[PDB]
Subunit: 412 residues, 2 copies
C-alpha cells in the first residue's frame, strides 16, 4: 500500500494532506521552495526536500525536481493538492511512467476533462446536462449567446470576426454556481456527496462557499448526483472530483469537472461526515470507497470563508509578518490554516492564509457561528479580507440565500 507520500503543494492544502497522511500512518515528504522553509507542514513533515527557488515556475511547477524528490526518498505516491500541477496530465503521466502512484485520476481522464470540448461531449454522452450550444445556431440557442457576449443577431457576424481574431452556447444571465462532489474507486464504485453553492465570487474567484445548496431538494440532489456518479464510471474516473454547474431556473448546466480535490471540500466533510482527503489516499492505494451511497445523508449546514491576506476594499495582496494570530474555536468551528503567530506571508503565491469553516443544525446557525468566529479572529501585521466576509454574512439577500454569481460584484 501507500507508505510514503510526496506532498507536491504548499500552504493550507499541504497541511491538510499531511494531517490525513499522519492519521493513516503514512510517511510524508514535503517538497518546498526556498521561500517556504517555515511553512507549518514543512516543519511537521517526516522528510523535507527543497525543490527550487521562490517562483512557482522553478519550484512547485518543476516536474523533474518533484519526481526526483519521490525517487530519492523512495516514496510511493505523490499528492498534487489543488492548483499547480494537479490538473496537469503531462505531470500525471510522468509520475505513473516513473513508477509512482499519482493521487488523482489517470492522465488520460485528466486530459479528457481538461479540454473544454471533449469534457462536454463526454458529459452529454453520459447524460450529464450541459449548456445548450455547439448561422442559425445562435437563433436555435436563444440570445444572449457567447463566442464576446452577443445580445443581438445583427451583431453576430461582426462579433464572431472579433473573437476569431470559436463556438457558441447559452449565456445564463444570473445563475448560481452549484457543484457536486464525487468519489470513484478502482472497484467500480462511484458516489456523490451532495453539493456546494459557491456563488459568492469576485472575478470568478470564490470567496464564500456553503453546503448543502439552499433550495435544492433531496430528489433533485439524487437526480443530478446520480448522473455525476454514472459519468464517473463511464469515463473511468478515479479519486475525488467535482462536477461544476451553472444553476438557473431549476436547471443544471455543466461547465467544468475539477479532476482533483477542491479548496472548499471541507463544507462537504462537515455535512456528510466523510474525510475526503483520506478517501483520496485510500482510493489511490487501491481500496474501495469506505462507504456506500445509502450511507450518506446530508445533516445540518456548513459554510466556509476564505481568509486572504489582501486589502478588503482594493483586494491588493498584503504580504508580511503576522505579528499576532488569534484563531477562533468552540463548537461547530473549524480552522484550516498553516499560518501561525510570527509567520511571514510571502508574495510569491496566492493570498490564502486560512479557511474558516462553520457547521450548524441549520443554515442560520452556521451563518451566526461564522459571524461570531470572524469577530474573535485577530490577524495583526497584515490586512485581511475579514471585513468583506462580515459584509457578506450580514447581507439580507445572502441571509435569505440563493444569490447569483454576479451578486457580490453587484454589491460592492
Amino acid at each position: 500500500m501507500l507508505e510514503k507520500v510526496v506532498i507536491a503543494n504548499r500552504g493550507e492544502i499541504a497541511l491538510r494532506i499531511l494531517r490525513a497522511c499522519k492519521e493513516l500512518g503514512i510517511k510524508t515528504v514535503a517538497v518546498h521552495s526556498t521561500a517556504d522553509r517555515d511553512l507549518k507542514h514543512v516543519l511537521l513533515a517526516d522528510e523535507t526536500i527543497c525543490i527550487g527557488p521562490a517562483p512557482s515556475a522553478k519550484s512547485y511547477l518543476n516536474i523533474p525536481a518533484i519526481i526526483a524528490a519521490a525517487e530519492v526518498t523512495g516514496a510511493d505516491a505523490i499528492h498534487p493538492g489543488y492548483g499547480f500541477l494537479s490538473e496537469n496530465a503531462d505531470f500525471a503521466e510522468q509520475v505513473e511512467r516513473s513508477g509512482f502512484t499519482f493521487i488523482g485520476p489517470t492522465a488520460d481522464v485528466i486530459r479528457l476533462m481538461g479540454d473544454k470540448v471533449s469534457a462536454i461531449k463526454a458529459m452529454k454522452k453520459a447524460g450529464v446536462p450541459c449548456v445548450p450550444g455547439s448561422k442559425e445556431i445562435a437563433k436555435r440557442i436563444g440570445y444572449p449567446i457567447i463566442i464576446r457576449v452577443v445580445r443581438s443577431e445583427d451583431a453576430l457576424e461582426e462579433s464572431i470576426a472579433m473573437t476569431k481574431a470559436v463556438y457558441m452556447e447559452k449565456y445564463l444571465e444570473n445563475p448560481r454556481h452549484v457543484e457536486i462532489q464525487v468519489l470513484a474507486d478502482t472497484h467500480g464504485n462511484a458516489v456523490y456527496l451532495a453539493e456546494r453553492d459557491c456563488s459568492m465570487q469576485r472575478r470568478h474567484q470564490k470567496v464564500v462557499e456553503e453546503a448543502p445548496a439552499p433550495g435544492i431538494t433531496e430528489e433533485v440532489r439524487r437526480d443530478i448526483g446520480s448522473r455525476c456518479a454514472n459519468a464517473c464510471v463511464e469515463i473511468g474516473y478515479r479519486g475525488a472530483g467535482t462536477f461544476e454547474f451553472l444553476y438557473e431556473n431549476g436547471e443544471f448546466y455543466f461547465i467544468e469537472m475539477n479532476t482533483r480535490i477542491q479548496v472548499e471540500h471541507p463544507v462537504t466533510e462537515m455535512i456528510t461526515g466523510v474525510d475526503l482527503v483520506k478517501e483520496q489516499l485510500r482510493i489511490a492505494a487501491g481500496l474501495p470507497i469506505s462507504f456506500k451511497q445509502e450511507d450518506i445523508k446530508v445533516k445540518g449546514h456548513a459554510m466556509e470563508c476564505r481568509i486572504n491576506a489582501e486589502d478588503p476594499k482594493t483586494f491588493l495582496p498584503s504580504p508580511g509578518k503576522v505579528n499576532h494570530l488569534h484563531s477562533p474555536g468552540g463548537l461547530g468551528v473549524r480552522w484550516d490554516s498553516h499560518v501561525y503567530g510570527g509567520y511571514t506571508v510571502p508574495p510569491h503565491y496566492d493570498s490564502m492564509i486560512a479557511k474558516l469553516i462553520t457547521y450548524g443544525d441549520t443554515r442560520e446557525v452556521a451563518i451566526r457561528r461564522m459571524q461570531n468566529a470572524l469577530s474573535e479572529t485577530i490577524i495583526d501585521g497584515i490586512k485581511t479580507n475579514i471585513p468583506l466576509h462580515e459584509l457578506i454574512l450580514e447581507d439580507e439577500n445572502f441571509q435569505k440565500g440563493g444569490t447569483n454569481i454576479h451578486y457580490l460584484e453587484k454589491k460592492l
Copy 2:
C-alpha cells in the same frame, strides 16, 4: 425571554458561555476580577464589570458583587458555569429572590443533591442504582468497606473510632468513572445524552475524557439513561446535569450528581450533535428541550485532553506569559480555549488553559487525531501537561480501552 446574561465565571467556560449567548443574540455581562481584565471573553463581552481583587474569595465567590452586577446592568439571568458558585444553593436562592433567572436547577434541588446523604436517598427512591452501604453492616456489604478504608473486620471497630474523631459502603477496588449527561426542562421533559468515561484521573482530578464509554452497549445505555431521566422528573430537575457512576463488573453505582454543566461536556456535543450550553440558556428561558429522546443517536467517538499550565512530571503550576501559541485545527479537531499569544496565565485560579477535543468515526480515529493535534500544538513560555497526554494516548491499555480510575496513578 433572556435578553442579557451575567457570566459569573472566567477562563474557558466563560468564553464557552459567551459564544452560546452571542449565537442566540443574548447580551453578555462579563464580571471579572482585577487579574482577569485581559481574559478573551472579557474583551469580547458587551458589558464588563470588575467585581473585586484577584483572590476568588473576594471576586468570583463574591455573591453580593455578582448580584449587584446583574442589578446595575439590568440583566435577566446569571450563568454560574462550573466550579465557584455553580453548586452553591445559597447563591441560587439569592439570585432568584433578587428576581433574576439562575441558569441551573432550583436552589432546593441543588441542596438536595448537595448532601451526599439526601442525594443517595433520592436516587434510591428514583430507581437509580447506588453503592451498597447505609455492627454486622460491614458483613452484609462485604469487605473492603469505607467509613478510612477497612479491609478486615477485626479492625472495623478501631477504624470507626479513628474516623468518628460516619457511614459505610462498598469499596470498589478498580471501577471506571462513567457519567450520564442529562437535560430537563420546565415542560416535564428529561433526556439522556449517552455517557462519558472519565477514568483517566490523578488525585480524583480528570485529565482525559471520552464519549461514548467503551464496552457500553446501547441496551445498557438506554437502561441507565432512562433511570437518570426519570430521576430528573422525580426530583424536579431543571437544566443540564450529570449523574456520575462508578462502573465495575458491568454494574453502575451512583456517587454524585453534578447539578451544573461539566468541563467535559464537549465530548457529548460531538457525538450527539447537541449544543449543551445553548440548551441551558433555552431551558432557563422557559423553552422545551429542542429535541426528543428518539432524536438522539450516538455517532462516532470523541475525546478530550485538558491542557494545563503545569509541569508534566511534578504537576506544580506554571503561570506566566504565553510567548507563542499555536493551536491545532483541521477536520475533527475542536479547540476550546481563552488563551492567546501574549496572554499571561495568572496564579490565582485553576491551571486549565485549553480543552483539545477530537472526534472521529471510531475511537481509533479520535485517538490518532488527538495525537496528531497535540504534536502540532505549541505553547511556549510556560510548561504544560501535553507530554502527559502523549504518554496516555500511546498507552497500550488506553488504546484497548476500559482502564480504571486508579490506572493513571498506577502508571506514572
